[PDB]
């Protein structure tokens, strides 16, 4: 997360860290006691041996796994979205099952899933969170980073991202002048919008031209467009 600030313990109880061979590489969001929604390019080409993935919940400081509110789970199964296209960076989303259930605490909670036709209009301010790079090609964070970003219209995003095909399964966010954006190491992490006291999973950090650059919004997988596929796994 670039241009963000250090979040405190419990701020985002649904945000989870993912480790591949004990190496933190992506974020994901808890949506039940058993499943996590993350990005497909996180597990692409390394999804056949699921126990090689670790999900760390209730985490705060990446340099501190000793906190008593943390819980670790091995990944039982990884279900990449059937239409993921690495070349097109389209449908960058994936389900991950925790071998063992987690126990909901004040530091571990599921994020609400948006309605299928939940509208996220431009100007709408939302939040991104992750332990990724603090600047492009820079070092990742320790304290979980958080940031607020305004959503764009796909029309406007396609505009600033001519080198890509902004599909209806994507949603973008970011400032015209740049400064705040999701970066490497944040993929799989959420893009959340509070809808009346409740936080909804709007997007899934997917891709974008570098990070925090002006008129170069971060692209996310538009969750409302996958809300049914996701809820089918629920249990």
């Amino acid at each position: 997360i670039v241009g963000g600030s250090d979040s405190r313990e419990g701020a985002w109880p649904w945000v989870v860290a993912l480790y591949f061979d004990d190496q933190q590489v992506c974020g994901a969001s808890l949506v039940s006691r058993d499943w996590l929604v993350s990005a497909a390019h996180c597990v692409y080409g390394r999804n056949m041996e699921p126990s090689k993935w670790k999900a760390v919940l209730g985490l705060h400081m990446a340099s501190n796994l000793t906190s008593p509110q943390i819980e670790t789970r091995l990944i039982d199964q990884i279900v990449i979205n059937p239409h993921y296209n690495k070349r097109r960076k389209n449908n960058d989303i994936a389900m991950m099952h925790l071998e063992m259930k987690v126990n909901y605490t004040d530091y571990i909670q599921p994020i609400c899933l948006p309605e299928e036709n939940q509208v996220f209009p431009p100007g709408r301010i939302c939040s991104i969170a992750g332990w990724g790079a603090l600047i492009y090609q820079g070092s990742t964070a320790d304290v979980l980073q958080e940031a607020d970003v305004p959503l764009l219209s796909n029309e406007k995003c396609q505009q600033q991202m001519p080198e890509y095909n902004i599909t209806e399964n994507m949603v973008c966010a970011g400032y015209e002048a740049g400064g705040v954006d999701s970066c490497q190491g944040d993929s799989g992490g959420p893009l959340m919008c509070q809808e009346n006291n409740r936080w909804l999973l709007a997007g899934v950090t997917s891709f974008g031209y570098q990070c925090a650059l002006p008129n170069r919004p971060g692209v996310y997988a538009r969750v409302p467009r996958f809300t049914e596929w996701i809820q089918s796994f629920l249990h």
Binding site: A39, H41, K89, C183, G185, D186, T205, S206, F207, Q210
Partner: peptide, 4 residues
């Protein structure tokens, strides 16, 4: 790549 550009992927995050």
């Amino acid at each position: 790549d550009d992927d995050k």
